[PDB]
Amino acid sequence: WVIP
Amino acid sequence: WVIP
Amino acid sequence: SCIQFTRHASDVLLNLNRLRSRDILTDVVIVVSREQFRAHKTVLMACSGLFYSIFTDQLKCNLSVINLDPEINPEGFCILLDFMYTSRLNLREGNIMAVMATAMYLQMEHVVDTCRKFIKAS
Amino acid sequence: SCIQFTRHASDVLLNLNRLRSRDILTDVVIVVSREQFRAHKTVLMACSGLFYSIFTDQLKCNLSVINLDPEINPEGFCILLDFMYTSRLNLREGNIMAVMATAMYLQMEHVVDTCRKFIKAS
Ligand SMILES: O=C1Cc2cc(Nc3cc(Cl)ncc3Cl)ccc2N1
Ligand SMILES: O=C1Cc2cc(Nc3cc(Cl)ncc3Cl)ccc2N1
Ligand SMILES: [Cl-]
Ligand SMILES: [Cl-]
């Protein structure tokens, strides 16, 4: 999971 | 396009 | 010896989401309490262990309406349906419990994992 | 303020390809000369300008069989259908002309672009  |  | 187009999967999902927003080729309604959500059976199956089981069933595969368990919160479902079609999860303090519970029911293991991690941190 | 799961689109496409290999929820046959290819209308639309136009047509959207132009080579189509479901293109010296011609007909602009680049290099 990432910060888009 | 890439070499997978 | 194939070549690969890096953005292909993302572009396919973006177009499937565009078909969903315009209600094109949607073949099922998911009923969550009073709320109704139109979707593509294939996308639901590709994202959820629960929908995968439902739509591979010789009788249920032919249903145009699927009713979820009354404990399922419509907002939690809406957030998860958006994630299915976009890869983006609108996880917030006020919805995390409903999102985790809905993801456990829908069998969306990667969403369950991030919810458990975010809850543990707080 | 969403979070994103990097591998989600790829995993969705991988599961759609698994449904295709097992012939699950396929809703159309594409006929290319004597050859028949089963697929999901939504995936075809998401990948091809031609299928997008066909299946948004109020009459054609309801067809279970679509016949392609007799000039279309079945192998070129097979390579492109595999690319649609995997992001991987089996581009070879012996098939590049048939793949480019089929991609131009199917309106798959990124495949047309790489074929034009590979032809120019040789
Ligand atoms: O967390 C999850 C997500 C998920 C998706 C699917 N859907 C498929 C799985 C396979 Cl192997 N082939 C085809 C399909 Cl559509 C099943 C279980 C789960 N669990
Ligand atoms: O090279 C290409 C690939 C492609 C895909 C689609 N399919 C869509 C486009 C839009 Cl805007 N919304 C929904 C869909 Cl399914 C149309 C044209 C082309 N050209
Ligand atoms: Cl997931
Ligand atoms: Cl393309």
Residues 6+ apart with CB under 8 A from D72: D32, D33, D101, D102, D105
Query: Around Cβ D18, how many Cβ atoms within 10 Å?
Result: 14
Asked if C33 is an interface residue toward chain D (Cβ–Cβ < 8 A), one would say no
User: How many DSSP H helices and E strands does chain A contain?
Assistant: 0, 0
N- to C-terminal Cα separation, chain D: 47
Resolution reading in Å: 1.9
Residue at token pair 């392609």? D68
From residue D109, how far is each of C37, D9, D49, D79, D93 by CA, in Å?
Answer: 33, 20, 9, 15, 20
State residue C38 phi and psi, 5-degree precision.
Answer: -90, 140
Query: Around Cβ C53, how many Cβ atoms within 10 Å?
Result: 12
Q: Report CB contact under 8 Å: A3, D6.
A: no
- Experimental approach: X-ray
Contact D37/C67 with Cβ under 8 angstroms? no
Query: C96-106 and C109-121 helices cross at what angle (nearest 10)?
Result: 150
Category of C57 on φ-ψ map: left (φ > 0), alpha (ψ -120 to 50) or beta:
beta
Say whether domain C1-122 belongs to CATH 3.30.56.10: no
Which DSSP string do the residues of D50-94 spell out, in sequence order? HHHHHHTSTTGGG-SEEEPPTTS-HHHHHHHHHHHHHSEE---TT
The nearest CA of chain D is from the CA of B1 a distance in Å of: 8
Give the three-state DSSP class for C29: strand
Contact C80/C36 with Cβ under 8 angstroms? no
- CA–CA dist C29, C64 (Å, integer): 6
Q: Which chain B residues are within 8 Å of D114, Cβ to Cβ? A: 1
